[PDB]
Structure 1
Amino acid sequence: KKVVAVVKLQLPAGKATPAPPVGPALGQHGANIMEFVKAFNAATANMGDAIVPVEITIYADRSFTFVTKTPPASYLIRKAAGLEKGAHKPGREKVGRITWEQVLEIAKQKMPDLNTTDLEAAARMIAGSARSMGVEVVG
């Protein structure tokens, strides 16, 4: 019997077990804890892994309800050319490298999130996550 809190947070598609913040915020709750695990780590597993939050609503008789999306543009770029950091010292650091259309696929998945249904404004989008880890756009 907990109130009707509007559950905006920030969680990850995969990293999913009742260690904080799974507990503090979802204290005002009563839901099946290992469901953001279960359904979310499975049905949106085609892309890979990584971070996507989750929007639940609690109702007093212990009711859950949640929807989610896509691992972060900084993951969909870690499979790209083999990164698991950035390049520490970019702005000149050209570790991994991608083509103007090997960075046209990556918005096939995060397309429904911005406002750009144009994969040009959604290309330079995910290709902006490039620079803040240093992977280039060739010629």
Structure 2
Amino acid sequence: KKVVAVVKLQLPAGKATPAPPVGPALGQHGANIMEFVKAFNAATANMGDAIVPVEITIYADRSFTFVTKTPPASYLIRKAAGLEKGAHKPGREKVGRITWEQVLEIAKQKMPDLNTTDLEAAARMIAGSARSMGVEVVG
């Protein structure tokens, strides 16, 4: 008969174990801690990896809910350069790259999250994450 919730957990892709923080915060949820490793890995059976943020909200009759955001802006950028890891030491060492368009294509994939309602601004948030992992922008 526990109280209510707007839980803002942060679970990756695939790893869906009732183990905390899916226990102490979702113990007052009555949450189907297993109707996620199916509802999730079904939509993310496509991707494969990349963490997927989530907000699980509980109510009265002891039922739950949860909507997920997009995968780290550092993800789509790793596949779009034949990368896995950043570059250890960003800036000086380039291990892959993205064009002036490939950055403007990604800013589309996550434009309904950031804050700006453009791409000359949005894309810069991407072009910024370029030197964050040592991945120069093809220009």
SS of residue paired to 1:77: helix
Q: What per-residue deviation string (whole Å, max 9, x for no partner) do you get for residues 53-105 of structure 1? A: 11111224321011112111011112111222211111211111111111121
State percent identity of aligned pairs.
100
Tell me the TM-score normalized by structure 1.
0.86
The root-mean-square deviation of aligned C-alpha atoms, in Å, is 2.0
Q: 1:15 to 1:131 in 2, by over 3 A?
A: farther
Q: Secondary structure at the match of 1:55?
A: strand
Residues 129 and 14 of structure 1, relative CA distance in 2, 3 Å threshold: farther
Q: Aligned partners of 2:69, 2:9: CA distance in 1, in Å?
A: 14
> How many angstroms apart in 2 are the aligned matches of 1:122 and 1:41?
29
| CA deviation after TM superposition for structure 1 residue 48, in Å | 5.0
Aligned to 1:103: 103
User: 2:62 — aligned with what?
Assistant: 62
Distance 1:41 1:129, change over 3 A: farther
Partners of 1:94 and 1:4 lie apart in 2 by 48
Contact 1:87 1:95 in 2 (8 A): yes
* Matched-pair contact (CA < 8 Å) for 1:13–1:71: no
SS of the equivalent of 1:67 reads strand
Q: Which runs of 5+ in 1 are unaligned?
A: none
TM-score by length of 2: 0.86
Is the Cα contact below 8 Å between 2:11 and 2:54 reproduced in 1?
yes
- Structure-2 change in CA distance of 1:121 and 1:46 (3 Å): farther
> How far apart are residue 44 of structure 1 and its match?
5.2
Separation of aligned partners in 2, 1:106 and 1:138: 14
